[PDB]
């Protein structure tokens, strides 16, 4: 299931970017 | 529960994104209210 | 797993985002 | 589904755009 792992990676990257923007 | 364990980072990230969007929207709404008062 | 509160919160959150940008 | 693939490409697209 590479697609689910890629979606997880994309969501994690988006969350990390938002957290950095919050800091 | 292995599938849920694998999807838990995605769910946590989605919830974080949702909270960020809601907080930004409330912040913008308060700014708009201040604009209306002005 | 759908009955988990976090999953439902995420679904309703993406719906809220879609309605907000609309 | 084709629309699930479209949604996957959309999520990856949003991530790539933010990158």
From Swiss-Prot, chain A:
The listed locations are: Postsynaptic cell membrane; Cell membrane
Disease with which this protein is associated in UniProt: Myasthenic syndrome, congenital, 2A, slow-channel: A form of congenital myasthenic syndrome, a group of disorders characterized by failure of neuromuscular transmission, including pre-synaptic, synaptic, and post-synaptic disorders that are not of autoimmune origin. Clinical features are easy fatigability and muscle weakness affecting the axial and limb muscles (with hypotonia in early-onset forms), the ocular muscles (leading to ptosis and ophthalmoplegia), and the facial and bulbar musculature (affecting sucking and swallowing, and leading to dysphonia).
In the record, the note on similarity to other proteins reads: Belongs to the ligand-gated ion channel (TC 1.A.9) family. Acetylcholine receptor (TC 1.A.9.1) subfamily. Beta-1/CHRNB1 sub-subfamily.
Q: How does it assemble?
A: Pentamer of two alpha chains, and one each of the beta, delta, and gamma (in immature muscle) or epsilon (in mature muscle) chains. The muscle heteropentamer composed of alpha-1, beta-1, delta, epsilon subunits interacts with the alpha-conotoxin ImII.
Purpose? After binding acetylcholine, the AChR responds by an extensive change in conformation that affects all subunits and leads to opening of an ion-conducting channel across the plasma membrane.
Query: What protein name applies here?
Result: Acetylcholine receptor subunit beta
User: What is the organism of origin for this protein?
Assistant: Homo sapiens
Q: Which residues of the full protein are shown?
A: 430 to 452 of 501
Curated annotation (Swiss-Prot), chain B:
Q: Which domain of life is it from?
A: Eukaryota
> Where does the UniProt annotation locate this protein?
Postsynaptic cell membrane; Cell membrane
Disorder association: Multiple pterygium syndrome, lethal type: Multiple pterygia are found infrequently in children with arthrogryposis and in fetuses with fetal akinesia syndrome. In lethal multiple pterygium syndrome there is intrauterine growth retardation, multiple pterygia, and flexion contractures causing severe arthrogryposis and fetal akinesia. Subcutaneous edema can be severe, causing fetal hydrops with cystic hygroma and lung hypoplasia. Oligohydramnios and facial anomalies are frequent. Myasthenic syndrome, congenital, 3A, slow-channel: A form of congenital myasthenic syndrome, a group of disorders characterized by failure of neuromuscular transmission, including pre-synaptic, synaptic, and post-synaptic disorders that are not of autoimmune origin. Clinical features are easy fatigability and muscle weakness affecting the axial and limb muscles (with hypotonia in early-onset forms), the ocular muscles (leading to ptosis and ophthalmoplegia), and the facial and bulbar musculature (affecting sucking and swallowing, and leading to dysphonia).
Q: What does this protein do?
A: After binding acetylcholine, the AChR responds by an extensive change in conformation that affects all subunits and leads to opening of an ion-conducting channel across the plasma membrane.
Into which family does the record put it?
Belongs to the ligand-gated ion channel (TC 1.A.9) family. Acetylcholine receptor (TC 1.A.9.1) subfamily. Delta/CHRND sub-subfamily.
> Oligomeric state and partners?
Pentamer of two alpha chains, and one each of the beta, delta, and gamma (in immature muscle) or epsilon (in mature muscle) chains. The muscle heteropentamer composed of alpha-1, beta-1, delta, epsilon subunits interacts with the alpha-conotoxin ImII.
From Swiss-Prot, chain C:
Q: Where in the cell is it found?
A: Postsynaptic cell membrane; Cell membrane
Q: In which tissues is it expressed?
A: Isoform 1 is only expressed in skeletal muscle. Isoform 2 is constitutively expressed in skeletal muscle, brain, heart, kidney, liver, lung and thymus.
| Coiled-coil annotated residue ranges, if any | none
Spell out the family assignment given in the record's similarity comment. Answer: Belongs to the ligand-gated ion channel (TC 1.A.9) family. Acetylcholine receptor (TC 1.A.9.1) subfamily. Alpha-1/CHRNA1 sub-subfamily.
Write down the disease named in this UniProt entry: Multiple pterygium syndrome, lethal type: Multiple pterygia are found infrequently in children with arthrogryposis and in fetuses with fetal akinesia syndrome. In lethal multiple pterygium syndrome there is intrauterine growth retardation, multiple pterygia, and flexion contractures causing severe arthrogryposis and fetal akinesia. Subcutaneous edema can be severe, causing fetal hydrops with cystic hygroma and lung hypoplasia. Oligohydramnios and facial anomalies are frequent.
Q: What is this protein called?
A: Acetylcholine receptor subunit alpha
Give the source lineage, highest ranks first.
Answer: Eukaryota, Metazoa, Chordata, Craniata, Vertebrata
Q: Which residues of the full protein are shown?
A: 386 to 407 of 457
């Amino acid at each position: 299931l590479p697609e689910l792992r890629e979606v997880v990676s994309s969501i994690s990257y988006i969350a990390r970017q938002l957290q950095e923007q919050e800091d | 529960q292995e599938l849920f364990n694998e999807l838990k980072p995605a769910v946590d990230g989605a919830n974080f994104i949702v909270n960020h969007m809601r907080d930004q929207n409330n912040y913008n709404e308060e700014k708009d209210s201040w604009n209306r008062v002005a | 797993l759908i009955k988990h509160p976090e999953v439902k919160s995420a679904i309703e959150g993406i719906k809220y985002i879609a309605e907000t940008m609309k």
